[model samples]
Target: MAPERLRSRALSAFKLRGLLLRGEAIKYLTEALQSISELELEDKLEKIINAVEKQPLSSNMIERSVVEAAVQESS
Candidate 1:
């Protein structure tokens, strides 16, 4: 599978498996963001949203940083 696909699957599985808690969610997502760049943010967000939509993860699985960046991108 592609990197984004695999990452999304792993993230969904991790969430389903109860690996992340509300308090720890952002920290982990932030950690994941370290490797990503501004140029790749849109694609990464797309992949994350697609996976979450298909599997139905919680809001905590979505990162505010990406959301803000996306809004800024469109404006």
Candidate 2:
């Protein structure tokens, strides 16, 4: 219903793994969730979480490129 609520949920999704989103990824997710059902958003972000985890020497921060990749993949 509200963008703020959705954005909060999105942040928690990232917080699920204590993963930080740098730059565009965080803003992108905030807007993205506004257009979709919360359920779909949750699963998609969770999927992205897995993909991010697979990175070599994975850091806690997630970049826009990886986040963009997963969004395209889920669509």
Q: How do the predictions measure up, each by TM-score?
A: 0.39, 0.72
Give a tens-digit lDDT track for model 1, residues 24-55.
44444444554566556455545544444444
- Candidate 2, backbone clash total: 0
- Note the Cα lDDT for every prediction shown: 0.45, 0.72
Q: Give lDDT tens digits, candidate 2, residues 1-70.
A: 6776776777788887887777678787666656887667788767667766765546777778777766
Segments of candidate 2 deviating more than 4 angstroms = 56-58
- What is every candidate's alpha-carbon RMSD to the true fold? 11.9, 2.2
Lowest lDDT sum, 10 consecutive residues, model 2, at 48-57
Native-structure RMSD, model 2: 2.2
